[PDB]
Subunit: 423 residues, 4 copies
């Protein structure tokens, strides 16, 4: 279809393409042969022969697609093509393997590449956020609670908040990786029966050959490490959605506080976040995976994994681009901050007044000053100055200072420094 711009990443689509999947499938079968020759399970020349045939092997992709439709899966047709190519040594291919072993393991190999690309995009996101946080550390603007002026903040403060989430997501990525990056090799019902007593030796050797962890046990039907990976994609997408909401709303005509380098990046991010969320939902369904293999639940991973990855990668890329070139308008920010003519810093007059009148009293006086500033379509300073119960204890100069929003930024700057932590 042709509608608009895609939120899916082409690099992440190349990664989960048929050609790439198949080549990881071959990679797995060759490593299995090698693992078995080292453990003396198949002849050493059979593995040598298999290794060499694979160096020169080029699958016949259309034949593969056609046979998959007949057989249900590409693995045994792929083994047939590889066997034909290898001659006599090919008779030792896929020895003790089942289809889900090769498909799970090839999937894990792609997930390794998928996660390196995700990590790379999360690191660019953090970099562009740290720059915004640093450069706009002292750029004042209105803080908003339910879309309405609350107290002054700075734009670097906002960027630091966005950044803090991505610092946490970077940490999550590193925790999830050793759980999901494990080999699958357990055979038709997960017992490796066809290998007699040597099954666990093969499984461990195979992990080593591919540079993967070893699972505690068969995970044909224990899908939690894969589900948590897509859940993680969905969590990152949610954090992208938050900043996309903020930016697209700051692009409102009457605000005009920023501009993207239609907020098209925000559009793609916000739609994509919901689609990734849906892929996480499917993975929670796919976990209800009955007995030793269930084709229904398993089929659900086949969209949720590659598409969760493609879409999450594309919206991270949209965020890298948007945040990297974000146009920030301190002039519009300053103008919007003055919109309430000091009302936004009523709290600062209360704080200053309380030691003189007491706390409830200070609150009552200033809220009265605020109702009148509003009702009289004038500034808070111009109301408060005529009110001797405030003006006399504070003085007019102090009132001018306290009603200037630029003077009430609190720990904003220090909070930014804390998150940046010497970046």
């Amino acid at each position: 279809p042709l509608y608009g711009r895609s939120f899916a990443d082409d690099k992440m689509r190349e990664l989960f393409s048929a050609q790439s999947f198949i080549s990881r499938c071959v990679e797995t079968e060759v490593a299995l042969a090698r693992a078995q020759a080292r453990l003396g399970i198949i002849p050493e020349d059979a593995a040598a022969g298999i290794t060499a045939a694979a160096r020169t092997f080029a699958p016949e992709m259309e034949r593969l697609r056609d046979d998959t439709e007949i057989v249900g899966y590409p693995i045994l047709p792929l083994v047939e093509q590889l066997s034909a190519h290898a001659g006599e040594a090919g008779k030792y291919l896929h020895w003790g393997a089942t289809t889900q072993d090769i498909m799970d393991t090839a999937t894990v190999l792609q997930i390794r590449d998928g996660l390196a690309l995700i990590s790379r995009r999360i690191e660019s996101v953090r970099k562009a956020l740290a720059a915004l946080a640093r450069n706009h550390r002292d750029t004042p603007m209105a803080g908003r609670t339910h879309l309405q002026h609350a107290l002054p903040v700075t734009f670097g403060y906002k960027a630091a908040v966005w950044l803090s989430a991505f610092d946490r997501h970077a940490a999550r990525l590193e925790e999830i990786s050793p759980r999901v990056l494990v080999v699958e090799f357990s055979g038709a019902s997960g017992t490796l029966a066809s290998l007699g007593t040597r099954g666990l030796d093969v499984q461990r050797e195979l992990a080593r050959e591919l540079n993967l962890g070893v699972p505690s046990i068969t995970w044909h039907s224990a899908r939690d490490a894969v589900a948590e990976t897509v859940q993680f994609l969905a969590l990152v997408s949610g954090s992208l959605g938050k900043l996309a909401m903020d930016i697209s709303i700051m692009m409102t005509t009457e605000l005009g506080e920023v501009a993207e380098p239609n907020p098209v990046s925000c559009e793609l991010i916000l739609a994509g976040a919901r689609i990734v969320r849906n892929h996480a939902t499917s993975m929670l369904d796919a976990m209800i995976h009955d007995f030793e293999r269930a084709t229904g639940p398993w089929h659900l991973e086949w969209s949720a994994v590659p598409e969760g990855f493609a879409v999450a990668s594309g919206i991270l890329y949209q965020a890298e681009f948007m945040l990297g070139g974000l146009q920030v308008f301190p002039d519009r920010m300053r103008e919007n901050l003055d919109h309430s003519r000091g009302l936004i810093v009523a709290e600062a007059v209360m704080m200053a007044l309380a030691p003189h009148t007491g706390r409830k009293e200070a609150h009552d006086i200033v809220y009265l000053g605020c109702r009148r500033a509003v009702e009289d379509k004038t500034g808070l300073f111009e109301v408060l100055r005529t009110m001797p119960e405030v003006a006399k204890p504070l003085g007019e100069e102090a009132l001018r200072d306290l009603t200037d929003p630029r003077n009430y930024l609190g720990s904003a700057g220090a909070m930014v420094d804390n998150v940046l932590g010497g970046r």
Copy 2:
């Protein structure tokens, strides 16, 4: 409503009750007063007075409920009741705090208790699974792929697979806890402006008083650590759903391989898993939390957190009970394993035959033997014995051995030992 049995945990409901929430709210305000007196921000006798008034303070809950409906939130009415009770020292309560600070922080205190109860139930689940895995390590049964006989497995093998997931969930719980268990104290728009330059000192002192971490920055609108907690609840629930599917299907009249101590625990687990999944979905939506506070998204946490916790706790409790007293029937298991009369171990004859005939040939001979056993409504041994291309190379005694499913369990036992790891 009155329908059937509840999948929600009453202990987890007491934990998120109004009374408990309110008492954590008071706990937070008192700790805030104490933190401020140590940093010289409020008078030491004001904090002493607040601490003592709180020891004797008992909220007026109906008054609180009524005022919340007027004000929108219980915090300021609760502060009013506590102020009245404390006399003069009460004027220093909620100093520099906003409502979401107290509500977020009190929520975090409940989550600490919620997570200890979740951890406790996950540990009982693992214990009952390890017992099943150990005692039934060698109990043979049919492995099933798409609900059909695949190869022999043991029931302890199945339990070890279920167990392996829960071993991983235990690890996840420990990783998530330091992220979610952090104080919230940042004031009305997250800058602590009302505290001048001392805001971060207060925030850190307050974390110490309550024994919580310190956030990198304000998380009024960065909700990822809370979202990941409910996502985690949903992942555990998914693993409960998998074993509930397996058990309820093994209770099928024609199977009869186990019994619960209607599979009512399986019913509750399986419905509950979908409801927890829905609470995780809501949390991903709640993450799109615009600016410095957005009431819509925030309102979504108010069901998703307490109810995600209550339901996940209740279905973990149902699993503790069911798995702790699971009735396992090795007799029905043995009978179902013999259903195919050796067909389930055709692969074992192939494995044995291959060295004599070659691999494709062995496969073709035995699949032919299998088609005839089926078409002739007899056992595989009785077909193969009359087939000299198998009988002569193997011998009839070997054929009897190879067609007995009890002889083809592979690494099942060793895989169980691996997961148990000296439990």
Copy 3:
């Protein structure tokens, strides 16, 4: 829990309470007895006795709750209490019935009341929208596409759009009602075997007694009419969410175009819409209802129906209230419309210019006029007037008229009249 305001309707909660459910359960059993006495299936005095005992019968609710936990369901304990109360005639109660018959049918009776209350709230919503549409038919304001000024619209036009959706939802409600409002009476596995050949006679008589339709066949496991009802709740909630988005954004400080009578109604509506959506999701899951009864899927209806109803009713009530008393500010609307100083009606100059210069040419001239108005921080009229390729063909008076947004409202008024259709 105590957090804020509830989005759930108390009337709709009373409707789905245990007491109400139970009383519909009794209503169903009595009607079943009556249906059977008319068809000569049970003695006429047995039905008379049952009818009279039920007039005076008051369930023992705590005993019921306790027994449900033992039995799994309230129906047979409720039949026991009713039997005891009726004396000898009680021995003919629940004759040929199963538990799901009584529970499905009692649920349908509540759904009838639930749908009348939903219809009532949808009619108040439409009324308050028609008033807004009518009174503000000619109130000009900026149209917004991706939150940015597009062309002029009127606020009545916006209200008419919101209204049009609710006109369609009213129609949907009437279509769904005869599908969902049917009796369930089919016995333990849906064949009414215990009634010999008279089962369908009883089922039809029973529908008549309760004033319900007759299903085509047993729907113990065909749940589509119930699922479509909650889906419908979710669709209405979505339309409430749209207008809640619009209103809460129009309450933005810099907009200030309306006010609710924190946009608390918008908060509740927007959170509630997602929760109703989640209840619809659960109903789609509950539809996968295996064989003749499956307790897992069925358990899912037990939250999704009563809670979908309660929440959808509460957010409709919030919308009735908010829209009924909506404060509309034509002054802020007029001010925001002038924000772009005629840029918002560049299209009107193009339209007028095209006959003179051609179409692409008119577009190029005016877009150039627009770039300069922006770059020169002045109004579009003040730029265009100095541009003889526009000023000379059009004349300055015409330019003044064309750059006034109030002159470019198109069919807004007529579109409003169309939707109102003589209301």
Copy 4:
């Protein structure tokens, strides 16, 4: 990607392809020109010229794709290509139109074709179900409640239940069609300002030209008729999931009651049902469509509509195929029905006994007979015959009859006839 078989329909993919979308886009623009020439809004030769250029027009698809990435949408680039081709008459193209008008309307044209294909597949589904219901009307089998033997049913009875849902879905399709099949033509902010006073005339003429209804008002941001269409797809998918659950479980080795013509159709249906459910979820999100156009929410339709259609069509096709050639095994059905050796018809002995002993007494006697049949691993008849409190009042011949499950099918046959209703 290459994994297994697709659940998406290629015909439905051709329908939502770029080429097809674009050709409907041209169809819309030509009809708009024609509508305008009839109302005297553009010259008659301009429309004639546009009509003729379109007969010969062939878009340059790669150029279109490239320009969409620059412009955001294919509409204005497509208008440019069509203008170039038409010469002078092309200057009247897209007169008063906005991009979403053409894209919404072209989408509606595809939905018309999509719904005809859905209707066609629902009619084949109903046909294959009616055949199964009719041919197996009297084929006895065990009814199952929570996967366990309940009472006898027939397989035609099961098929009639499945059928009844699809009869209702056929009715729903006809109700939804006039709501969703309406033109979109309202211009940039939905007021048709650029057409002065003639906008509604054009909109109505255009509906007539394309053979669509006329909307009550602009639906750029009122998306309920589109959302309800995908919700409907999700409801049908749910009903497919129910029968797919039933069939795949009846393929369990120990059951063996049916076979598909791996239950691969059941796999695809069951995964697809969850994916369609997810597309319905996205549509409920897309409904929160702020102001006069919001690109984020709108972008969500761009996957949910074409993919909801493609997947729902593919799983309907899988069901047509599977149900059309379903292998039904009355022999395995009869064998499983005898599994309980009369226990499954204990209720029939109770029914017969009650007039002699009373009702509670009859229940107690037979449940005792049932406990002993179980504990003694013998048939119910062989226990009951030795029990004079049953044997003497009933007689042994009657006991033999009552313990034969084939004698207890109730209204099964009549219920089948009711649903078939003379098919």
